[PDB]
Design a binder for this molecule. Structure first.
Ligand SMILES: COc1cc2cc[nH]c2cc1C(F)(F)F
Ligand SMILES: COc1cc2cc[nH]c2cc1C(F)(F)F
Ligand SMILES: COc1cc2cc[nH]c2cc1C(F)(F)F
Lengths: 291, 291, 291, 291, 291, 291
């Protein structure tokens, strides 16, 4: 990076300006998961980019997953799973584990990484200050809607209290657990929770970190990779994508139809992917806009 | 409670007034542990008293322990302990468990209990917003000061940021983990952390919930139970008490010599012990004052 | 009160919590008169309950009468009364006396009693800061509407300026005099003024202290005493009650139809009646709600 | 006033500017009494000048007396006086009358007069919000210090709370009664109370309205009238003035030695004397400055 | 001014009060030009009256012209003019001169004059903080609408940012230059810009200083001078007035139809004309009101 | 810039982070002159970097010169110069020109350039709101201190009012003219004014744009170019540098001895020199620190 001439270093920074202007004072919700969460270089870069946004006057909000870590802890505790379709049933016991891992392990690692740069990160769940509630959700296996326990969707969000937190200069790191109307805590899918938080907060962008270059229309045709697409036609392509990018795509449509100006599916295996997606035009991701 | 005449119900409430006046707008730090944490009626009463304080314009701050729950989780995970003296060595592995249990299990239960009354509780540790730091602590076994791993005392406290949280009408529920100056998270004894938080916040009172009637000078002489004592003579009685009330007593002296007007050791096995200690003169506890 | 066990003292305080939650941060307007104003123990208790509300974060507003004290001062000054029906005509001279007694004697006693607990009470009339205006009122004697001088109803209220006063932590003590649109000060009935203030301020409750157990439907049948009634049927019972509880009942209907969630007619001869009505379920009063 | 040319009307207003600049945003305490209080044209002019100051962004504070009105009310009530020296003894009964007349009659008239111009005036005494306290004072008759009942000097003043009131755009009208440390209300001499309020509030000027042209050094020599004098030499002239201007002079010295930049003894028999003293150089009054 | 009795000095100041009340806390926009700008006594008086308004809590906003000064500078620089009709074409070169003279000479003189009284004046143009924009304007010569270069009308105004400036206690002195939507700065007629600023700011009055006694209906008939007129009939008299008072009249109609309660054409050759127009009833000007 | 790989674009932006953290919420004063002011590409880049800083939450303050533009305007106006030493005497006439050019031409161009990015720039001089004063300065020619007219140094600065302006999100663009204590406006050297503003505002950095690579100790030895130097030894090198970098060096010493953490002499001929100096380590400039 030292053999690179100085006048091109200048140019790269100057080309950030249109996006610094767009994002200044705005909320950006980031779904964090995948390899961006498991490799130590990626992780550290992610935390530094969160500090970057904050030290530009941008208001990042982090929503994290943790599927594989929950599973490993269940196996360590010898908790036998029940499975309907390909879904583990979330008993009261599985939820206690899920909450303890998400909030007391996975969330903690990110908060500490970010806080290496300053007193920025703060961890929360829907339980704290009743920041958001959940509604129990069913799944459809082999055509029939079925109960798989204490798993929900975000119901309502405390928009005011959450925007207080970010105006104080803090970076919320959200673990997706929240209680229903009777106080019963549910585990929420991180991808959908992020889209819901983004719409409730009036975010300027939603970013989804995933382990992909971007959205392929006809995977695996390499020339099917797309850089921008509207919600109308993306909704039509939904039943034709692999099972893994379904929830990431649904989040994007749900957020952009909710009024979030754009959602982005970006490559979490790229170091500093947030910086490249937000402050350069050389992004590999896929941008979703309404239409 | 219905056969009790109405004019004595009036008198009991009216006698709360001198203490409502003393505590209005003030911080009260409460160490929560023991049976007040394990029995479901006690627990529920505790959470309701926290809501009580808040709905009087008092600012409670809860610091909780969780020793036995950490141990049970270590045994469930098959994590073999190392012991110097009677102290488990806190390896990096034991800390991850301690943090996950304290913050992702024990803290969560209290937050949800309190939040049944309103959007009040919020959980935090020293890691969040760098609210407090830790300094690694040694112990003295058989006369020699020895390392027992990632266990510390509270070093510095972010007084301003924490008092912001309570002025917003929130009830912090603190899990005693905090990073040292190099970002390495340590587990802090809950009793001492509570005394440190109380002095840093300028609390009007520190309350220590324990499984005792109060401080006995010559346990087990029933007529040795004391209701008030000064720090000077309490410091002299310290080497003569059973090992369990040592840390609770040290917390009280350290807090009251730090300027907290009074610390109280009260009976956590009594339903609504906080209400009786703060709003009545029939408290069984022991009050510590400077002298 | 000392022979009463401690665990029932706890229970009485804990049962206040649902009402502390309901009233926290809310305005409660209290009409003060009758024996609660003339007996020194009752008075002192009343003032202490006003301090109680304030030291819970509740915002009391006191409206007081003083009929008998005006009369005694008129007799002391040798001011001969004119009477139409059973109404003294309020000449300019009678008003000067009424204002001087209400604001410079009766209001002063309450302010000083309350202020024994802190710098809380502040006395005012509609004249100060133009806080409310009056409209001259007629009475109907023997079927004909007749002028009885400078006696009015509350016309408009300065809601903003009055709610400033209470947010400053002050307890307004209102003497019911106010000028009309031409600057001419009138004396307003205290019961009706209290209902008007309560509706203008968005009070959560209106309390009317009177010298009765509660509203009897068929006085004197002891089994006609009612604990709750709606405005629709209370309006039907109005022409059938003794002349003294008419104005207290009209105040309640007018306030609750104005949107005040409930008005209460409570026994001012009971020490700490405000505490028992607001923080216990053993109230003897009568609650009025809309319907 | 119509035959007066327009370009001299311009000049008179333009010459106000140096004093508008000096007084803008500043407190001016005005002792109001004498004929400025009893004649209806003077009174009305006084109230209009208070509105003038307020509508310039000046913060007037009015302190009023009422000696003769108290006396007339005592005679009307048949209250026999006790006299030591030339001082009526202020029994508990005399005080109730004094307070009722000052606050419920004399203060009310001024508040209503001022409020004809806007919602400006608000009446208060030391009792309200504990705005100031009193200390019982003795008098010296025939060489010996003697008790004359519930008469005091201003002890402490709630500077913060009072300056809140004026920043809200209100004009306090103070009746000089205040409680001592035991809650016992005393009557304070209005002239001295005004000097105390002026020093506690950091007033820019104290104005004393009196029934005189100004301070005569050798009354009645017409050529002894002075327009400015320092505190050092005014203190020397004190034992040589008629009994009536003693308290007005003592107020001025006490205020100006307290740091009030200047005190002024002005002719209350002159219509709009406040306007002429503050906004013109043709004042007849006497200015006191430190030296 | 010294031979004038003191009690009439009082009366002149007291008669200001109804207008101090009307204007307190309100915006007053003043178009400044003509002889009030060129004679040193008039100028100094003008600046002192601006300080007067400010030291009454009134918020003046000054808009200035400078036609003749631009012309003299063009002649000094040897810049040959192009003329269509009687209009100089404003080339890019003429604008640079116009802006440099208006903002860097004429505006500076006024700011310094006002600032002799305090830190009040601040100079601005539409360019600063994008406070207002311009739209290019045509003129009609001999019946045809024609381009005369970079001359415009005020397009949009930043009402919020400008009212911030005055709430800070500052007196804006506006030079009428502003950029169009493409960033191209235009010169705006000062009379029309003042009417636009007055309507955008919700001014209570617009004052137009001119070199006339007032509006004559049938100039030169001396008995045709009018003191008040409504917009409806003033619009009918527009095509019948001399070319010089056309733009001043159009400003008044445009402002008063925009909701400004009244616009005034006053004699700038009168020392302290602003003081006489605003604070006396002996104004020579012409008041415009809607109708 | 497109053939450059994306992962190095990421790295260049990520390496900005330590300096975004250092500068966030801080004042940076920038002296703007030289070729950075005359070439249209440099100029545009400069204005974009000012918008960059602002859209990072940094508070830039621009101080500009304009020596050559004043000279050209004097020659255009045929104003014959008087010269003592190599200094033009600043007569009242020369100052009017200097002020008109600096504030009404040179300042305007920068404000409009910056404002192409948003409503950021606002132009001011010491005259506006009395933001800073000047003290007349002498020069020493051939050994003797001599008067060269209305040329000064910055005397006092209104730190509070200026920091208000930047907290509002504005970018002040300062033209260095200010009045002395008698209201007489002087022209101040831009380099020294910038150092004075930087110390008065508590700036984190002072940047001096010049037409040089950096400070050469032994110009022209290419290997004498320095990247960092302390004030102690820089003060010793002062009498040994070419006449042009003297004032730039004096500014740096005066600012850094005034407590500004570092001053920087950077190459204004480099496009985006501000971005490279502040956000990269490949700066060519010279950093001055205390020592
Ligand atoms: C302002 O609200 C908060 C502040 C802090 C500071 C540390 N943790 C916090 C959690 C919150 C919460 F949860 F209320 F949003
Ligand atoms: C804020 O307004 C007030 C404050 C105080 C403090 C003592 N008496 C007061 C009366 C008022 C009033 F009357 F404006 F409400
Ligand atoms: C608050 O805004 C301003 C303040 C000051 C102080 C001096 N000049 C100022 C110009 C402005 C502006 F231009 F933003 F209105």
């Amino acid at each position: 990076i030292e053999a690179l001439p100085t006048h091109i270093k200048a140019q790269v920074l100057a080309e950030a300006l249109p996006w610094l202007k767009q994002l200044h004072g705005k909320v950006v919700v980031v779904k964090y998961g995948g390899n961006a969460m498991t490799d130590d270089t990626l992780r550290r870069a992610f935390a530094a980019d969160m500090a970057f946004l904050r030290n530009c006057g941008i208001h990042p909000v982090v929503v994290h997953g943790g599927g594989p870590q929950i599973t490993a802890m269940l196996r360590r505790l010898g908790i036998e799973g029940d499975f309907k379709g390909g879904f583990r049933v979330t008993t009261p016991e599985v939820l206690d584990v899920a909450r303890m891992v998400l909030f007391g392990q996975v969330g903690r690692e990110l908060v500490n990484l970010i806080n290496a740069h300053g007193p920025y990160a703060v961890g929360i769940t829907g339980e704290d200050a009743q920041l958001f509630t959940a509604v129990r959700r069913s799944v459809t296996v082999d055509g029939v809607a079925t109960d798989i326990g204490l798993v929900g969707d975000v119901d309502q969000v405390n928009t005011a209290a959450m925007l207080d937190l970010v105006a104080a200069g803090r970076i919320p790191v959200v673990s997706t657990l929240a209680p229903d109307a009777d106080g019963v805590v549910h585990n929420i899918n991180a991808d959908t929770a992020a889209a819901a938080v983004a719409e409730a907060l009036g975010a300027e962008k939603l970013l989804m970190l995933t382990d992909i270059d971007g959205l392929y229309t006809r995977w695996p045709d390499r020339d099917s990779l797309v850089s921008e697409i509207d919600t109308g036609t993306l909704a039509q392509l939904l039943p034709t994508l692999e099972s893994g990018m379904v929830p990431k795509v649904e989040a994007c449509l749900r957020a952009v139809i909710g009024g979030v100006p754009s959602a982005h599916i970006i490559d979490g295996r790229v170091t500093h992917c947030v910086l490249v997606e937000l402050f350069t035009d050389a992004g590999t991701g896929t941008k979703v806009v309404r239409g």
